[PDB]
Amino acid sequence: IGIRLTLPPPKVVDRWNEKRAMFGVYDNIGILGNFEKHPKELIRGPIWLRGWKGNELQRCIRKRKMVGSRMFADDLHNLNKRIRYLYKHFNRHGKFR
Amino acid sequence: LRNRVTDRYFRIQEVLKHARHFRGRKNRCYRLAVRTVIRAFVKCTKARYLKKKNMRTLWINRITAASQEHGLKYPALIGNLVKCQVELNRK
């Protein structure tokens, strides 16, 4: 009974909406623009992970470092707890050593 | 629930179709059907040896019956046919 008895409404995807059509443009801004702008500068998103990658622990540490002062009280408490727990997990648990 | 299974109905049916002829809840409940279906398939696999074993036993019994109807014993019949080079098998 975990199966729907009717076909879901048809999903129409416009492959040529402006976003899809212009996707990727200026990904070569650096190499094709005298390196004035690095491609990572095209990244739009959270300030603490613009042009940067890492595991969850590193992401949490960076979030606390960069916007920790601006976080809400309970969100910051949760982030501190998450950082503590991730430290314990990554530094004391696992198959390998 | 980013990724949820949507085929579980068919995954269950693939097993239940083989158990539809069982007795009791074994033909309806997957938890019970799967165990019996696995046992049924294992028995089906192991039964190909017993089919051959019983066929030869059946043939030997029937040959003994006929040879006794002619006063012979199955060992005598088989051995003497071999010595005559009549390579007829028991079937």
Partner: peptide, 26 residues
């Protein structure tokens, strides 16, 4: 509701098969 289309299509096909078997067309 579970997002997806393939399971729904398969179930519709099975329902059609069972309906045909129960009430085969003339």
């Amino acid at each position: 509701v579970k997002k997806g289309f393939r399971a729904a299509f398969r179930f519709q096909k099975e329902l059609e098969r069972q309906r045909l078997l129960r009430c085969p067309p003339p």
